[PDB]
């Protein structure tokens, strides 16, 4: 073999701050979730 700094290929990945929050969202229980979701509802005035 040999040591070098070449390039590979073929993959797929993408992420963003807001999407992240959307993903962690399903990892926690409804009861503990509804809490997180109530908190959103004070901040947002057009969401009931």
């Amino acid at each position: 073999m040999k040591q070098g700094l070449q390039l590979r290929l073929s993959q797929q990945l993408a992420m963003t701050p807001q999407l992240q929050q959307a993903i962690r969202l399903l990892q926690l229980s409804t009861l503990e979730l509804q809490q997180e979701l109530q908190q959103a509802l004070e901040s947002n005035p057009l969401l009931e």
Partner: protein, 258 residues
């Protein structure tokens, strides 16, 4: 059938012929080759074959077959439909796929590396290329024209370049003659260039040419040609830097120190 025309600039009676030979093969879809030395005026010709073809409708991408990545060769050549950024709708482009219905220009074919040479091969006549991933390969209708200044036969003897690829590619090879051999369009080439040149350096008007000027410019074997004439004239002209008295002095090489 429309003709681009551009700058034929040939009064050789052999450039005429050169134009005549390429014109017959312009309609043809077969692999072709173009051969030139250090100063040959070949880039225009590759365009003059495709400019003159029915598929003049097609796109005319021309890759630089010497600079590609060894590693990305597979991707660069083919390309991978999955693209990038996950479920992204944007599809990958490709090399041979982005030239369907249009001529493809390959340059520095002799210099093209062994990995590239083996990779060409198998895609030249098969017509099927498959992007990394998937089980489906799609035929492309792509016209191969190759421009090279190096001598292919010598490369074959060495074994540096595969013999089979050269043999398969281009039934007919256009022949370009050196400038020292035109010998005739210099009065014309030389003025044309100089005329451009006057506006690039912002003069009004050419002074004219001394007889001596033309004794020197005829008399020389002009190593790496054409382009050479431009340089001999373009410099010499800006050099002189005026429009009272005519041009009197031309320097062949700006190496010599004095």
């Amino acid at each position: 059938m429309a003709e681009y025309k551009d700058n034929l600039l040939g009064e050789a009676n052999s450039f005429l012929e050169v134009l005549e030979q390429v014109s017959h093969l312009a309609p043809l879809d077969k692999p072709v080759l173009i051969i030139g030395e250090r100063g040959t005026g070949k880039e225009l010709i590759a365009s003059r074959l495709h400019y003159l073809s029915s598929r003049w409708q097609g796109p005319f991408i021309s890759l630089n077959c010497a600079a590609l990545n060894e590693n990305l060769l597979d991707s660069e050549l083919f390309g991978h439909e999955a693209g990038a950024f996950t479920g992204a709708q944007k599809r990958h482009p490709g090399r041979f796929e982005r030239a369907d219905g249009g001529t493809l220009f390959l340059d520095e074919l002799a210099t093209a590396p062994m990995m590239v040479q083996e990779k060409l091969l198998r895609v030249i006549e098969y017509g099927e290329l498959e992007r990394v991933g998937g089980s489906q390969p799609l035929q492309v209708n792509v016209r191969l024209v190759c421009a090279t200044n190096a001598d292919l036969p010598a490369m074959v003897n060495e074994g540096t370049f595969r013999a089979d690829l050269l043999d398969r590619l281009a039934f007919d090879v256009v022949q370009l003659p050196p400038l020292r051999e035109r010998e005739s369009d210099i009065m014309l080439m030389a003025e044309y260039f100089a005329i451009q040149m006057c506006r690039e350096i912002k003069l009004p008007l050419f002074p004219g040419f001394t007889e001596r000027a033309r004794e020197t410019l005829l008399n020389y074997r002009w190593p790496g040609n054409i382009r050479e004439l431009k340089n001999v004239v373009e410099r010499s002209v800006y050099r002189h830097g005026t429009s009272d008295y005519p041009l009197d002095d031309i320097i062949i090489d700006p190496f010599k120190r004095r």
